[PDB]
Symmetry: D2
Subunit: 431 residues, 4 copies
């Protein structure tokens, strides 16, 4: 049982609490789209862990390369190159759009964003960073300074030159023009304010293509192209954080491919490592050269370490070989339709949005007031668990509670259906 009192005692005595509450179970094993508790109960992992296990848990191919490298080439002095690093860097150049040529292989999402923001600052000689008021880029310094969805209070001033603009949110619009939600006009208005505040040191804009922690907010048609122009005009770089969207989850290899807008710096992390700590930034040859002339530095312990790099390469291979990007569209379609059916059945479902296998379900009291459904979101999440389905709700100011759904790209039709099943039961049990 999940009740080993030695276990729970040690947890209470020796663990630092870092956000949320701990699930009241002991996870013993994981395989595919499932995690198993101490009683052997299988829990369908609809969030791919912390939205990373793109190939599900313990993917045989992944298990193999990890073995293969643990015993042959593990960690090295950061000045020493090896094959997996060069291969992964090369691969990354080949599959990202034209204009992205050179990669830096790191360990975590925050780190990747830090490395990108530092390069932007160096190459521009400037320091001001603009992000979305509902963003999430990480817990470390610069990354947290550009993170507005949470964590800004009680921990001292943020980095100097931090600005946020509102993110385009079609579900709950706030900027109208001619009895119309004009999100491009909103963008124009936001920028005018920045311009007036800036000290003349705008360095970069950092953005997620789909705000995940912010509540599955997809940047609408033509927004990105518009943003990139605002940047170009100001001599700013555009940094695209594809930690959650990259590596086939939205139905394209990279979300940026959908819009055809290529960023100056692209960052990747969660999905790329598929559960293991591996991250990266990819930039153009011109930007890298200048950063280099300027003495760019981002020297860490695990930068260019062979093992993680070998893992990343394998992940790319399987995704490509097994056409998991296409699969994301097919299963996403199936999942999306199911969600829409639930919304037909239940008034508490106010919206279903997202793309491919990155979907969001917004819980509301009134599908007209779109009044946020406080508490409902949480019992639902609770019943899901009992029902055997791991869900994750994000709750932000002035919005309804949002379920972030992101199953493995290797998820099955049957699994999708089970999840749909369990979710329906949880909602009716919760009302």
């Amino acid at each position: 049982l999940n009740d080993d009192a030695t276990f729970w005692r040690n947890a209470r005595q020796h663990l630092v609490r870092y956000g949320g509450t701990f699930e009241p179970m002991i996870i013993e094993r994981a395989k595919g789209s499932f995690v198993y508790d101490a009683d052997g109960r299988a829990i369908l992992d609809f969030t791919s862990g912390q939205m990373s296990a793109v190939l599900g848990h313990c993917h045989p191919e992944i298990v193999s390369v990890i073995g293969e490298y643990a015993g042959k080439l593990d960690h090295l002095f950061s000045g020493m190159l090896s094959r997996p690093v060069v291969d992964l860097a090369t691969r990354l150049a080949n599959i990202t759009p034209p204009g992205l040529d050179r990669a830096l292989l790191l360990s975590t999402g925050a780190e990747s964003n830090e490395a990108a923001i530092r390069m932007a600052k160096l190459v521009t000689g400037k320091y001001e960073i603009v992000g979305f008021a509902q963003s999430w880029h990480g817990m470390t310094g610069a990354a947290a300074s550009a993170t507005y969805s949470a964590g800004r209070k009680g921990v001292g001033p943020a980095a100097v030159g931090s600005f946020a603009i509102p993110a385009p949110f079609t579900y709950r619009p706030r900027f109208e023009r001619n009895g119309a939600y004009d999100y491009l006009a909103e963008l124009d208005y936001a920028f005018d304010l920045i311009d007036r505040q800036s000290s003349g040191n705008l360095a970069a804009f950092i953005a997620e293509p789909i705000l995940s922690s912010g509540g599955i907010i997809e940047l609408p048609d033509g927004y990105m192209a518009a943003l990139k122009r605002k940047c170009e005009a100001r001599g700013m770089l555009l940094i695209l954080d594809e930690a959650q969207t990259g590596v086939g989850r939205t139905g394209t290899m990279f979300a940026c491919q959908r819009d055809g807008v290529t960023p100056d710096i692209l960052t990747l992390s969660k999905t790329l490592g598929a559960g293991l700590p591996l991250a990266a930034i990819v930039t153009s040859a011109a930007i890298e050269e200048r950063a280099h002339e300027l003495g760019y530095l981002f020297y860490t312990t695990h930068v260019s370490d062979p093992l993680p790099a070998a893992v990343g390469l394998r992940v790319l291979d399987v995704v490509q070989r097994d056409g998991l990007v296409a699969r994301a569209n097919v299963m996403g379609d199936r999942l999306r339709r199911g969600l829409l059916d639930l919304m037909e059945r239940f008034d508490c479902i106010g919206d279903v949005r997202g793309r491919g296998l990155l979907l969001g379900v917004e819980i509301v009291k009134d599908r007209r007031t779109k009044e946020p459904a406080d508490g409902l979101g949480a019992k639902i999440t609770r019943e899901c668990m009992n029902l055997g389905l791991s869900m994750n709700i994000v709750q932000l100011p002035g919005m309804g509670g949002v379920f972030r759904i992101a199953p493995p790209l290797t998820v099955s039709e049957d699994e999708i259906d089970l999840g749909l099943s369990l979710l329906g039961q949880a909602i009716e049990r919760a009302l």
Copy 2:
């Protein structure tokens, strides 16, 4: 050969340069105290990679737990606990001094420092951080802001409330009292200045027990106890960064044990993961409770991930079981004596310092002027390599060039001797 032109071509075209130069070889395999190039030449790893491979490369026991977990419990939603996490946290509490009870398991050294600085700020309601002018804590925001040995120029303002004090450096003293280098008086003097600058928001002092990047600078007798008192008097926390010193390298499990001064927050990383990305912060139950009441947040993708945690546990086990801490003293003694013999043979060796298996050799032009030996340091390093020994020299302002020597705790007497051999040959070949 190391000359695969496809390889070097891809490296040049697709890699972001991040500090230094790339070694002109292709590392294909690694085992024990050695790395092997493409021609199969064995290079003795006197830096344990990037000072992390405590058990050398590809340690069978490590290879096994990694296999064991890759296929059984890999990565999880951050709210889900598992056995390796609770076991590692518990172990960490049991082997660190009394006053360190609760752990947070992360991925990198910088992250660990960020998590610690954020907790300090939260719990004190303050934001100013003091470090050593020769420190190195990481590349991300807060960590870099507290890093003064390098990286402060051309990348915008540092975090608000950043201060540094000089580190006690016996080899090249600068503060005398009564014809005596009074490093405690220096400490007093440094603090008075801080006090005068502070806005009344001193939150913490962050320090390495032995400044590694700063040039193997060991805090002298009674310094630490003195520092901790300066902190206590100011209501500041003392954060000890044991990324390089922790886990038996100095001859004690933790450097802080030698002085008997226990920090409020202890951070670990490199050695703990033994090449893999795993890091941690350990704090007292009182500090954790308050951070918790205050809503502390440090939620990342890989926090509490089972695989790395399982690796960390194994590393602790082997170190303990094979008495590798004691071994550090025995081999360190042997290595130290060899270095002293070289210094007898060569005038260019100005100092040999450090502890256990974290040693430093300062290259000088004149062992009286102690004039820094520019360039000499670099040919030596160069010949070492040709000779088949991987060394690392750090060069800081107003100091001679320093070789940072840190072989695996599992290093052999024969290996130590080979290294001593190769080093002697490299010096005579270089003069």
Copy 3:
């Protein structure tokens, strides 16, 4: 003549240039609503100098108290009180609304704002300051940090915690709700963004009731009451900068009286000293007491100096006795109507706004496009001068050029007419 080459030579060799260009004349004397050049030509002062000479130049009553005090009580140690200081402080308490009790007598507008912002910060324990994107509060540190109409570039980062929100501008609206410019909804929207950026340290909002440098922008009906509520809800103080509006210019003693919204801190300067350097902050007894308990400090050389204080008292007396506040309405009406007649005559006049004797005329190319009239504004200003009328145009981004009209409260009907005359002639001569 205005051409003394010794004069112009010395000006060029020994004067620091600090903004704008120097008028090509030598002002020798001033009296009433006029300044006189070296040829004796009289220039009608429609800006009361730098918008300060409320009683016109060289007001006999002012000339007398200045004599009276220069020879009897001039400057003192800042711990020494005297009658004019206590009398002026008392008077200020008696004529400002209930809730404003205690005054601090300083020298300049910027200083007054600094003293107010410092008190706000002290009493709240916070540091973030919000202002209008088109504001003007001064050239010194905090004041400049809260100044967004100009001066933010090329001089380093601004104060930490600086935010701006757009000012309500009816002439050129940008926020619509239901085909309507909803400036209260804009206010709500602005604040939501602040809230998301804030580190949880909102200390105060600083505002001008009528943005003078920003282009004579009057806060519309119900705005202020709304702003004060946003502040109250956030535990922020509202600081009202009445440097240009205070002391009867808008037709009320204080602009804040019109709206019936009383600020936590009121600052005054230009008009209060009537050309001489005198400024002040007035706050409630509760705020002063706490600032005091908290050790508030604002100790300068001329704080509480008797001479300026005696001047300020006299100015208040004459304004009251000669009913100059009412006069401001009567002459303002006359001036406003004249301006409206010109706008009938000339398409280039796009708007006439303001209150009492603080009026603005916005020059436009097309009274529909409301396209800004670049250059036109400047010849007009130029011809005015030749015609013998001193005007001042402020030109801000995305707005037409604006003439800031503010004659002395003692201005005559005839003078108003002359100005109207000269202005009409200048416009036709300039097109």
Copy 4:
């Protein structure tokens, strides 16, 4: 009497407290070296008010020009030049050393420092400012950020890039070299630390030649020349704040003349206006030209106002004509010798320092421990007052209490003697 209860009642009800306590008397008139209370008691002003009345109170010549201008040319639009402004600017160029050519005429000391720091920042493209840990430059933003003797707590973060170094203090030395207080070596040591902290944006060093608020600390022989070299080497400007030292008080027109080291920017204030608000910055033609090309802005209400400028000119005239600079030396000698005699009489006098008519007397418990005499300083100050002598003691950390003595340059031999008399009586009455 000084007891008008209406007066004291109004003071209590309507005055903001801003530091210290109010003297329990009502000052009614002032003339020469004396101030008179309500009972007509004459108080000898040994601090020239707030160290400004260089020509004593109500100087007939000053009274006259003030009359002369109040009635003829008072205040003007800031773009309008007049004779007093050009004359004063020209005069300032002629009497300051070669290299100081162009002046900016403002109102207060803080403002003058702000204008100088802003110019330094503009012209260097940098933002970091270094000052002395015991400095005093003003209460506004930048000025306060560079002020370390007091006021840094409880009012939010300081300006970004603020650093302090210890000031050379011969009375209580803390940096020895070869059993010697080597203040140049201290300077070297201080700078090394700065260099290590700097983000590579050192803009200027701001300093008082004699730290007045800091406790009458004179920069020792060769210090300044040394400082200026540290600046030059770093591409930093040296800003000299001569608010208390300028205009003949130290026995030279400007303190900087004594050392023969000319600053890049010189600021003046208190003494220049002789009780009235007038201040200035003087810089070289090269610096002004570049600031100008760069768009320097410092546009205030009273910049270039004729009245104050006319006052400043008169003050310069009298000082020169009546050889008040020489007088400062003669009377200073007399005052200094008297102080030394007291120190012979009383063990509580630990030091007498300063220059010309800017002298300091440090009160100590033990003339060996040099233990600070807490409380003694205050009764002495108290008895002085009763005795009829206005003194001012500054009390800083780790120092004895200091009397800042600065009588009018027009002080008489008899007055000096009276002061010496009263001071002796106060000390014996206080022990």
